[PDB]
Design a protein around this nucleic acid. Structure first.
Length: 99
RNA sequence: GAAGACGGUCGAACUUGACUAUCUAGAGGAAGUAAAAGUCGUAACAAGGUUUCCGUAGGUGAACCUGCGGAAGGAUCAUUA
């Protein structure tokens, strides 16, 4: 509904391996692998898929854990990409809902 | 009557070896437990769709199946001269 951007302690990541036990692996836009955690509103109200644009929170004393906040589906994700936040090597690969 | 010496006894300890109680690393690999969403299939609970279970043996990705002998914790307390 609204375009909210990243802040201090938050960034964007791409889901690489979709696991169980309410956690997943996401590749952050800084160049490090992290074990993210599914938020309490993100278990069943929304469904997180692979290769999607998500909001990932930083951890200030350990640097191998994270947690996920939001999810951008198609148009706000491509509008955020048009603004410029990521290295251009990463590929969207047309992330949206299929038919 | 001192130092010293042979022999005997008690005897700490040393060197060559074995046994030995506990702790700390260890490639390799099989296990158990706690995690809201991974994959395959549906074994069990209603006759769960092949009734379940026990002992033994073989089989197969996985739950699992089959042969032999028992149990009712069975869906039968009973089927007529």
């Amino acid at each position: 509904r609204e375009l909210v951007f990243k802040e201090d302690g938050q960034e964007y990541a791409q889901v690489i391996k979709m696991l169980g036990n309410g956690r997943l692996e996401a590749m952050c836009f800084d160049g490090v692998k992290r074990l993210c955690h599914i938020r309490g509103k993100l278990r069943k109200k929304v469904w997180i898929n692979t290769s999607d644009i998500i909001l990932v929170g930083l951890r200030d004393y350990q640097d191998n854990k994270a947690d996920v906040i939001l999810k951008y589906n198609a148009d706000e994700a491509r509008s955020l990409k048009a603004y410029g936040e990521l290295p251009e090597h990463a590929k969207i690969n047309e992330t949206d809902t299929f038919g």
